[PDB]
Design a protein around this motif. Structure first.
Motif, PDB file in Angstrom:
ATOM      1  N   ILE A 186     -10.938   1.311   1.504  1.00 38.10           N
ATOM      2  CA  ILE A 186      -9.729   0.834   0.848  1.00 38.10           C
ATOM      3  C   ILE A 186      -8.824   0.216   1.918  1.00 38.10           C
ATOM      4  CG2 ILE A 186      -7.617   1.630  -0.386  1.00 38.10           C
ATOM      5  CD1 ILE A 186      -9.660   3.563  -1.891  1.00 38.10           C
ATOM      6  N   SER A 215      -8.284   4.020   4.278  1.00 41.99           N
ATOM      7  CA  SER A 215      -9.138   5.107   3.781  1.00 41.99           C
ATOM      8  C   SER A 215     -10.590   4.656   3.707  1.00 41.99           C
ATOM      9  CB  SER A 215      -8.687   5.544   2.400  1.00 41.99           C
ATOM     10  OG  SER A 215      -9.259   6.790   2.040  1.00 41.99           O
ATOM     11  N   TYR A 239      -1.994   8.293  -2.153  1.00 38.54           N
ATOM     12  CA  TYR A 239      -1.843   9.260  -3.261  1.00 38.54           C
ATOM     13  C   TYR A 239      -1.595   8.609  -4.633  1.00 38.54           C
ATOM     14  CZ  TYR A 239      -2.055  13.835  -0.724  1.00 38.54           C
ATOM     15  OH  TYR A 239      -2.443  14.958  -0.023  1.00 38.54           O
ATOM     16  N   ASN A 240      -1.251   7.318  -4.622  1.00 42.50           N
ATOM     17  CA  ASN A 240      -0.983   6.525  -5.827  1.00 42.50           C
ATOM     18  C   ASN A 240      -1.931   5.333  -5.942  1.00 42.50           C
ATOM     19  OD1 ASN A 240       2.688   6.877  -6.075  1.00 42.50           O
ATOM     20  ND2 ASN A 240       1.008   8.243  -6.682  1.00 42.50           N
ATOM     21  N   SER A 241      -2.231   4.952  -7.186  1.00 42.22           N
ATOM     22  CA  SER A 241      -3.119   3.830  -7.506  1.00 42.22           C
ATOM     23  C   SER A 241      -2.507   2.478  -7.123  1.00 42.22           C
ATOM     24  CB  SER A 241      -3.472   3.864  -9.000  1.00 42.22           C
ATOM     25  OG  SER A 241      -4.419   2.864  -9.351  1.00 42.22           O
ATOM     26  N   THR A 242      -3.185   1.781  -6.216  1.00 41.53           N
ATOM     27  CA  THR A 242      -2.746   0.477  -5.723  1.00 41.53           C
ATOM     28  C   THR A 242      -3.592  -0.626  -6.368  1.00 41.53           C
ATOM     29  OG1 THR A 242      -2.185   1.498  -3.563  1.00 41.53           O
ATOM     30  CG2 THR A 242      -2.307  -0.909  -3.605  1.00 41.53           C
ATOM     31  N   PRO A 243      -2.956  -1.651  -6.973  1.00 40.22           N
ATOM     32  CA  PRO A 243      -3.749  -2.726  -7.590  1.00 40.22           C
ATOM     33  C   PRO A 243      -4.370  -3.689  -6.572  1.00 40.22           C
ATOM     34  CG  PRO A 243      -1.427  -3.162  -7.836  1.00 40.22           C
ATOM     35  CD  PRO A 243      -1.550  -1.731  -7.413  1.00 40.22           C
ATOM     36  N   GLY A 244      -5.588  -4.134  -6.858  1.00 34.73           N
ATOM     37  CA  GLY A 244      -6.273  -5.051  -5.967  1.00 34.73           C
ATOM     38  C   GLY A 244      -7.653  -5.482  -6.419  1.00 34.73           C
ATOM     39  N   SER A 270      -6.336   8.176  -2.095  1.00 38.04           N
ATOM     40  CA  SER A 270      -6.396   6.711  -2.009  1.00 38.04           C
ATOM     41  C   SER A 270      -7.144   6.111  -3.209  1.00 38.04           C
ATOM     42  CB  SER A 270      -7.119   6.316  -0.722  1.00 38.04           C
ATOM     43  OG  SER A 270      -6.954   4.951  -0.399  1.00 38.04           O
ATOM     44  N   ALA A 271      -6.717   4.917  -3.647  1.00 39.37           N
ATOM     45  CA  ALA A 271      -7.327   4.198  -4.779  1.00 39.37           C
ATOM     46  C   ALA A 271      -6.944   2.734  -4.953  1.00 39.37           C
ATOM     47  CB  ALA A 271      -7.090   4.929  -6.098  1.00 39.37           C
ATOM     48  N   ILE A 272      -7.884   1.970  -5.515  1.00 39.88           N
ATOM     49  CA  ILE A 272      -7.733   0.545  -5.824  1.00 39.88           C
ATOM     50  C   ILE A 272      -8.101   0.351  -7.301  1.00 39.88           C
ATOM     51  CG2 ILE A 272      -8.764  -1.807  -5.480  1.00 39.88           C
ATOM     52  CD1 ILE A 272      -6.698  -1.100  -3.323  1.00 39.88           C
ATOM     53  N   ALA A 273      -7.167  -0.214  -8.071  1.00 42.71           N
ATOM     54  CA  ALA A 273      -7.357  -0.489  -9.502  1.00 42.71           C
ATOM     55  C   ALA A 273      -7.510  -1.993  -9.754  1.00 42.71           C
ATOM     56  CB  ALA A 273      -6.177   0.068 -10.310  1.00 42.71           C
ATOM     57  N   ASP A 274      -8.711  -2.416 -10.143  1.00 36.73           N
ATOM     58  CA  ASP A 274      -8.999  -3.822 -10.428  1.00 36.73           C
ATOM     59  C   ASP A 274      -9.093  -3.974 -11.959  1.00 36.73           C
ATOM     60  OD1 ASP A 274      -9.707  -6.519 -10.164  1.00 36.73           O
ATOM     61  OD2 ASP A 274     -11.401  -6.131  -8.832  1.00 36.73           O
ATOM     62  N   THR A 281     -12.740  -2.291 -12.556  1.00 37.32           N
ATOM     63  CA  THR A 281     -13.255  -1.281 -11.641  1.00 37.32           C
ATOM     64  C   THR A 281     -12.145  -0.419 -11.071  1.00 37.32           C
ATOM     65  OG1 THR A 281     -15.037  -2.826 -11.009  1.00 37.32           O
ATOM     66  CG2 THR A 281     -14.717  -0.918  -9.554  1.00 37.32           C
ATOM     67  N   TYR A 282     -12.441   0.865 -10.935  1.00 34.82           N
ATOM     68  CA  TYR A 282     -11.505   1.815 -10.359  1.00 34.82           C
ATOM     69  C   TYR A 282     -12.201   2.482  -9.171  1.00 34.82           C
ATOM     70  CZ  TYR A 282      -8.118   5.704  -9.916  1.00 34.82           C
ATOM     71  OH  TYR A 282      -7.203   6.616  -9.443  1.00 34.82           O
ATOM     72  N   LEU A 283     -11.759   2.113  -7.971  1.00 33.50           N
ATOM     73  CA  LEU A 283     -12.291   2.647  -6.722  1.00 33.50           C
ATOM     74  C   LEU A 283     -11.344   3.725  -6.193  1.00 33.50           C
ATOM     75  CD1 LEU A 283     -14.126   2.545  -4.090  1.00 33.50           C
ATOM     76  CD2 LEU A 283     -12.921   0.434  -3.526  1.00 33.50           C
ATOM     77  N   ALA A 284     -11.817   4.967  -6.126  1.00 39.04           N
ATOM     78  CA  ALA A 284     -10.994   6.071  -5.636  1.00 39.04           C
ATOM     79  C   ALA A 284     -11.661   6.971  -4.624  1.00 39.04           C
ATOM     80  CB  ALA A 284     -10.482   6.911  -6.783  1.00 39.04           C
ATOM     81  N   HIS A 322     -20.883  -5.637 -10.877  1.00 42.53           N
ATOM     82  CA  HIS A 322     -20.575  -4.547 -11.800  1.00 42.53           C
ATOM     83  C   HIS A 322     -20.791  -5.007 -13.231  1.00 42.53           C
ATOM     84  CE1 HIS A 322     -19.535  -1.759  -8.835  1.00 42.53           C
ATOM     85  NE2 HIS A 322     -18.232  -1.943  -8.761  1.00 42.53           N
ATOM     86  N   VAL A 355     -11.808  -5.574  -5.954  1.00 39.19           N
ATOM     87  CA  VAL A 355     -12.924  -4.778  -5.457  1.00 39.19           C
ATOM     88  C   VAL A 355     -14.109  -5.720  -5.259  1.00 39.19           C
ATOM     89  CG1 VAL A 355     -14.500  -2.823  -5.886  1.00 39.19           C
ATOM     90  CG2 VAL A 355     -12.146  -2.687  -6.623  1.00 39.19           C
ATOM     91  N   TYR A 403       0.780  -1.228   0.000  1.00 37.97           N
ATOM     92  CA  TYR A 403       0.000   0.000   0.000  1.00 37.97           C
ATOM     93  C   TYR A 403       0.819   1.289   0.000  1.00 37.97           C
ATOM     94  CZ  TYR A 403      -3.728   3.365   0.558  1.00 37.97           C
ATOM     95  OH  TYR A 403      -4.510   4.469   0.359  1.00 37.97           O
ATOM     96  N   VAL A 431     -15.919   4.041  -9.328  1.00 41.39           N
ATOM     97  CA  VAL A 431     -16.585   4.269  -8.033  1.00 41.39           C
ATOM     98  C   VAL A 431     -15.764   5.328  -7.287  1.00 41.39           C
ATOM     99  CG1 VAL A 431     -17.617   3.199  -5.975  1.00 41.39           C
ATOM    100  CG2 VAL A 431     -17.268   1.802  -8.013  1.00 41.39           C
TER     101      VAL A 431
END
Lengths: 314, 316
Positions: free
Chosen positions: A98, A107, A26-31, B108-112, B95-98, B67, A33, A23, B16
């Motif tokens: 998150i 977050s 401020y930056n995009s973290t892959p995972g 904060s963000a999660i990129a699937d 999906t892009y959760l920010a 989704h 959802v 983690y 999202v």
């Protein structure tokens, strides 16, 4: 047309973002959802619909994508949300979180704006749904809405209470008298009674205090130690002995649901407690919060359970 | 109906966004507003196309989850047919959760975005008949390896349309552009693809003439405020609309590609395709959202009649 059970309450959509890497903010973290449908009353309504109860679920939704997804899952399972409040341009109550690599949150956004839109005017326009209901499930979220529902429909429908938490139960201890059925845990009951409950003799004194106020049925959850009951005529403690796995949460929601089944099928008190507890014994084990729940799956596990029954008299 | 269709092949993303309505703090639950929207260049193109009446076949990558059902339901409501898409059992729909702060910045963000790269040749082969019988096929510059496979296998069977997405993404497909029937770059993306600067009209004519030399049939170069430059080998010119005020540019070029799709399907002359597609781009540019909620054939035609144009035609 056919007798139904009305569940009134909120629906909260849970959107979790689990990190599958290190983690970094401020930056995009892959995972991954995950989207799950929560909210105490929605969990109860789903569980009821899954076991065959003719369920009407009155809620608060927005005309967004999360609201449409809730309405679609509603038709698939069985809980009719046809009489719910729809807020045009508003969002369906959602919790965005998150989580990091460990599963702990870094977050979060709680969008609860739509829950405050519920008013006395919308209750009045849906009067026939409240009156024609056999039983009505409510939680302790809004004491002002609860007080209104009680003094307007206590003689027309039979109200069932799910206290949620000890704190939420305290702001409602003066309204419990108008409910037909209350379902607290050991600690929520201590709050509603006004004295410490440590053993069986205190549970009998607690339930008799509740019955004295006008409550017909009392069910006190003992957390692993079974359930205590009080018909006013029949009193006891029925305990199970087997399953205890991943996340013991969501079990109380499944118990309220089985109280609803046992009531609609006029089952004897000792058997309502058993059926409802089987639904809790399922939910505790399998994570997924609801996994699968069918009329036969609950009736299948029911038989293969060690019932430690204790009967009391006043 | 056995009527002719346009194929759009590409990604579908569900965005999202959580906007903070109080001071943001990490490890803490902040009160806010959740916004759910559908994205992906190709998904936006397909929506804009179905909205104006084009019989659209949208082949994407879904995930069987919640989704996935959201995208499918929106596709049945609008009219972009996703029947031939790839569905991944147990997988996730892109999906892009920010989570944004009180200022609007991503904290904060999660990129699937996993499923986008799960497209394989076996699936293309199973749906070869959808590609072969498609009058036109829209692609973006996301997957160069799969683009090459599609071009090599279907260039003479269907007419490919390119939306370069960015200048960076354009350099990776520069060796492959010769197989496209239509390319649609902006000034900078056209410079990358041509290999020389584009500063004026003569360079625009030189760039477009070079693309036509490579085998490309129709060239459209977006010049932001200066309009659209076009060249098909016979007709060449530049058209611009007056009175265009922009709010948000995201999704404007998507709508332009969709308008080219409409123009081609209705066999309209190039000057009218440019105007129709530009009107669609103008409508999307005047709204804060990526797609205008009221956009349909009637609104595009109503705005096209009410528009004053600056037109220029070059010969040779």
């Amino acid at each position: 047309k056919e007798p139904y059970l009305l569940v009134f309450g909120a629906s909260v959509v849970d959107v979790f973002g689990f990190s599958k890497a290190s983690y970094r903010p401020y930056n995009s973290t892959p995972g991954h959802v995950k989207i799950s449908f929560g909210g105490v009353c929605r969990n109860i309504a789903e569980n009821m619909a899954r076991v065959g109860v003719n369920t009407n679920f009155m809620s608060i939704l927005g005309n967004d994508e999360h609201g449409k997804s809730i309405v679609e899952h509603s038709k698939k399972i069985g809980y009719h949300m046809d009489d719910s409040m729809v807020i045009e341009g508003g969002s369906t109550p959602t919790y965005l979180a998150i989580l990091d690599e460990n599963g702990e949150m870094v977050s979060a956004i709680a969008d609860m704006k739509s829950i405050g839109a519920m008013n006395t005017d919308f209750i009045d326009s849906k009067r026939e749904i409240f009156e024609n209901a056999e039983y009505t499930v409510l939680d302790s979220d809004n004491p002002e809405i609860m007080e209104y529902l009680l003094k307007n429909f206590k003689d027309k429908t039979n109200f069932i209470l799910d206290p949620v938490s000890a704190e939420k139960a305290s702001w409602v201890k003066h309204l419990i008298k108008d409910f037909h059925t209350i379902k607290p845990n050991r600690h929520e009951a201590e709050i509603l009674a006004g004295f410490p409950i440590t053993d069986t003799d205190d549970l009998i004194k607690a339930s008799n205090y509740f019955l004295g106020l006008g409550i017909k049925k009392v069910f006190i959850s003992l957390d692993a130690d079974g359930i205590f009951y009080n018909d006013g005529v029949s009193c006891g403690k029925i305990k199970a002995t087997e399953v205890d796995v991943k996340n013991v949460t969501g079990a109380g929601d499944s118990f309220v649901a089985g109280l609803g089944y046992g009531y609609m099928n006029k089952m004897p008190i000792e058997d309502i407690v058993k059926f409802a507890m089987t639904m809790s014994n399922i939910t505790i084990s399998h994570e997924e919060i609801h996994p699968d729940m069918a009329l036969d799956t609950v009736l299948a596990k029911l038989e293969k359970t060690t019932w430690e029954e204790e009967k009391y008299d006043l």
